[PDB]
Amino acid sequence: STGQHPARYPGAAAGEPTLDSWQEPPHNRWAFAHLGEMVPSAAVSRRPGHALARLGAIAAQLPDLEQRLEQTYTDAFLVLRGTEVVAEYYRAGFAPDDRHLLMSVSKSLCGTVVGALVDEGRIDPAQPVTEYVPELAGSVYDGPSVLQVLDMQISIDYNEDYVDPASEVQTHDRSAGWGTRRHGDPADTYEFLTTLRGDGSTGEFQYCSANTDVLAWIVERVTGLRYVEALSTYLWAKLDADRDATITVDTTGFGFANGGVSCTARDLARVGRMMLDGGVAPGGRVVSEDWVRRVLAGGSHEAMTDKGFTNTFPDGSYTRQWWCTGNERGNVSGIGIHGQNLWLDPLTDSVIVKLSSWPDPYTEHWHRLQNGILLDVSRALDAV
Amino acid sequence: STGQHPARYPGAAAGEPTLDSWQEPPHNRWAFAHLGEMVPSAAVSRRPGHALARLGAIAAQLPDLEQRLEQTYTDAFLVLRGTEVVAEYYRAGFAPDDRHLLMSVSKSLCGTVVGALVDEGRIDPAQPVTEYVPELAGSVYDGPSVLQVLDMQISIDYNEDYVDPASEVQTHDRSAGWGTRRHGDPADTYEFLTTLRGDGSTGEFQYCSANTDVLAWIVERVTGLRYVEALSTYLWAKLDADRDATITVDTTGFGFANGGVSCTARDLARVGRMMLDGGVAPGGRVVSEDWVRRVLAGGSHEAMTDKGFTNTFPDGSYTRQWWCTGNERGNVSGIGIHGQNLWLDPLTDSVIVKLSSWPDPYTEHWHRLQNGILLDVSRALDAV
Ligand code: NA
Ligand code: NA
Ligand code: NA
Ligand code: NA
Ligand code: NA
Ligand code: NA
C-alpha cells in the first residue's frame, strides 16, 4: 500500500480515472478537458525544413560552432546573457517554440520545488524520508534523510543495464508508462519505489533516478497537490514562460519527476535566470537566496566518486539535484541523457541551454564533446 | 496486412517508434520533440474556480439560459453571429482557452478534409473505397462507394452495446488506445476496420464510427500524409485558430478521426464560420462552395430511419459527416456523444458551439434538452 495520493480531480477516488473509466461520470467532466493525460495525442498545427542559426557575438570566437552543434545532435541551443538572448540555434524540423524532453534536467526542476517548500518550512531536509512518506518503511528509503535523497547519497541496488528488462532502470520506466508493462511489474511509480533495497550505507553519491521520484512523492504528501500542479505553482507559473511545460504521467496521474518534463529552450533558460537572480523570478521568489548559494557552492567532494564526472571535473560534486563542476568558473548544470543541459555560468551572468538527441544515452565521448562546447561558449562570453 | 501507412517521421520504418523503441536512434530525434504522442502527459501551467457567464444580447430573451446550460452539463458554450462573439459561457474550472474533446463532432472535421480532396480531384466519391484502400477487399467496405461512407449508408454488423467488451464499439476503442487492449484485439485501428462485415446492403443510414476512420485512411492513401498532418494542412492551419487542436493517436500514430479531436470552443466556431462563408477561411479556401451547398441541402430523407433523430426532426437526413435537421431554419450540426454540437444557423449567419459532459453518452431526454437550447438560442438571434 502506498498511502494517500492527490486525486486526479476534486473528489476522485484513488486511481480514477483509468484508461477504462475516463468516459464515465463523474470522471468525464475532467477527462474531456484533459484527454492527453489519459491517451497519447498529437498536435494538429494552427500554423501552415531549415536550421535556424543565430549565433551572434559568439560566432566570431567560435566560427565552427554550428558544425560542432550538428555533430552533437543538437535540437535546440540558446545562450541567455543577463536578460538577453545572445545566441540561438534550432535544427531543421525543430521550431524555436517547440518543446523538447529534458530527461534528467527534470530533476533540477524537482529539486527547485523541494527548495521552495524548504523555504516555507514545510520540508526539513534533516528529517528521514519516512517522516513524510511512512509507506517507504522497509525500503532503501527507510533510514536516509531528505537531504540524502536531494544529494543522491544513498546506496541502492539499482541495475543501470537498460538492455536487460529485469533491470531496475527498465522496470522504473515501465512502471511509469515509458515502456509497455510486463507481467509482475509494479502498477505505478509509487509502488516501484517501495520495492527498492540497498545495503543501508549512505554518504557516497550514487546517481539514481528513483531518488527524484521520492522527492516528488514527498512534495505531494506535504502540499496535497499533484506533482504536476506543484511543479506549476512553485516554479513554472512564476517564470513568465511563453508556453506551458508538459510532464509525462503514470496511470495514477503522477508526473515522472525524474525525467519526463518537456519545455521550450527559451523557457528552460528562465529557470537558469531565476538561479542567477538569487532565486527570484518575474512572478515572485521561487527559492531562497541561501538555497541558490548552496547549489552554487556544491556538495561534498568526497561523496563524488563517479569518474564519468570527476575525470573531467576533478573537484566536482552534486547537491540538491544539480551537478557542480567545481571548475575555475564555478559552472553548475542540470544534465540529462542524450545531451540535455541547463548550464549556469555565473561569471558572465549567463545561462546555456542545449537540448539534443544523441544516438546513445551516455558515452564518455559525447560528454567530452558536449562539455567542450559548453566551456568554449562560456569562455566566449568573458570580457576581453 | 493493412498496406502502406504514412511514416511517423521521415524515414521511419512501419510502426516505429513503439512505446518500447522511442528512446532509440533514429526515432529519438522525433520522439524527444513529440513525446505526448507516445506517453500520456499533463500540462504544467504557465499561469498561476468560478463560471464565466457572458450571455449578452440573448440573456434578455432567454433569462434562464445559464441554468439550462448547467442542467445539460455544459463545459463551454459560444455563439458567433457573423464574425462577432455575442455570447459565451464556461463552467467553473474550464478556462475560455481550454480544449475540450469533440467526440463525433470530429467526424464533421474529417468530412471537411475529404471535401477538400474532392475539390482537388484527388478523391472521387463515386469510386469504391477499394480504389483507394485495396486492403479493405473482403470486408464490409468492399463494394460501397466513398460517398456511401461519407453519408453512412452501409449496413455493418457493429454492436453498439458498449457495456459488452466483445461489442464492435468497445473493440474499436481498444484498438485505437481509448481503452486497455484485451487478448486477441486488433493491433491498431486499420486492422480493426478490416475485421468488419455486413450483409452487403447499402442505401439506408446506419451511424457507425468506423466509417469516419475509413475516410481518414483514404485521406492518408491519397495524400501520403498522416491524418494528423492532413487535418492541419487541409483545415486547421487555414482557420487562423488561437490554439492547435489535438487528436488522440493509436500505436501507429493514426489519429482517431471519428472521435478524438480536442479544441477550444472559439476555434471550433471558426469551422462553422468557414461553412457559413461558402467554404472559405482566413488562410484560404477549405472546401468548394458546392460541397458546402450539398451539406446544407441534406442527404436523402428516405435513407434516414434513425427515430432518435427523426422524432425531433421528421425531415432530417445526414450527408458528408453532418446531421441535417431539415427543419424550417435549415439547421445543420456536427454532433458527438455527451453533448457536443457544432450547430449552424444560416438564417442568422450564426454558429453555436456547445461542449458538454453529460453523465450518459446518449439518452432521448438529454437530446431533447440540448436541441431545445440550440433552437431557442437560434430563434433569439432572429431580427425582430
Ligand atoms: Na526505458
Ligand atoms: Na535575489
Ligand atoms: Na529555499
Ligand atoms: Na470505450
Ligand atoms: Na465563399
Ligand atoms: Na469540396
d(CA B272, CA A373): 51
- A243 and chain B in contact, CB less than 8 A: yes
Q: Can you give the residue ranges of every domain in chain B?
A: 49-124+225-384, 125-224
DSSP helix/strand/coil, B322:
strand
d(CA B69, CA B80): 17
Distance B217 CA to ligand 6 centre (A): 18
Select from B69, B10, B2, B1 the least CA-distant residue to B226.
B10
- Quick one: CA torsion of B378, B380, B381, B384, rounded to 10 degrees? 130
Kindly state the DSSP code that residue B286 receives in the 8-state scheme: -
Question: 10 Å Cβ neighbour count for B302?
Answer: 10
Structure's resolution in angstroms: 1.2
Distance B247 CA to ligand 6 centre (A): 23
Method: X-ray
d(CA B32, CA A248): 12
CA distance A324 to chain B (A): 26
CB-based burial of residue A83 (10 Å sphere; 0-12 exposed, 13-18 middle, 19+ buried)?
exposed
Question: In B209-347, where does DSSP find H-type helix?
Answer: 210-223, 227-234, 265-276, 289-297, 307-310
Is CATH 1.20.58.710 what the domain over A125-224 is classified as, yes or no?
Answer: yes
Residues of A in contact with B33 (CB under 8 A): 75, 94, 98-101
CB-based burial of residue B291 (10 Å sphere; 0-12 exposed, 13-18 middle, 19+ buried)?
buried
- Quick one: CA torsion of B336, B341, B342, B345, rounded to 10 degrees? 140
d(CA A116, CA A110): 10
Domain spanning B49-124+225-384: which CATH class is it, in words?
alpha beta
Rg (CA), chain A: 20
B41 catalytically annotated: no
Strands A261-263 and A100-101: antiparallel
DSSP helix/strand/coil, B347:
helix
Select from B152, B170, B175, B150 the least CA-distant residue to B160.
B170
Question: 10 Å Cβ neighbour count for A285?
Answer: 15
DSSP helix/strand/coil, B77:
strand
CA distance A297 to chain B (A): 30
CA distance A382 to chain B (A): 32
Give how far the C-alpha of residue B88 lies from the chain's centroid of Cα atoms, to the nearest Å: 22
Question: Which chain A residue's Cα is nearest to B19?
Answer: A179
- B299 and chain A in contact, CB less than 8 A: no
| Within this chain, domains B49-124+225-384 and B125-224 share the same CATH topology | no
Extract the C-alpha cell encoding B136.
Answer: 479493405
d(CA B250, CA B7): 13
Distance A118 CA to ligand 3 centre (A): 5
Is A228 close to B99, i.e. CB distance below 8 A? no
Question: 10 Å Cβ neighbour count for B62?
Answer: 17
CB-based burial of residue B133 (10 Å sphere; 0-12 exposed, 13-18 middle, 19+ buried)?
buried
Residues of B in contact with A242 (CB under 8 A): 46
Residues in chain A: 384
Long-range contacts of A135-140 (CB under 8 A, 24+ apart): A135/A1, A135/A2, A135/A3, A135/A190, A135/A194, A136/A193, A136/A194, A136/A214, A138/A194, A139/A193, A139/A194, A139/A195, A139/A196, A139/A197, A140/A196, A140/A197, A140/A198
Three-state SS letters, A266-289: HHHHHHHHHHHCCCEECCEECCCH
- Shortest CB distance from B48 goes to which of A29, A33, A237? A237
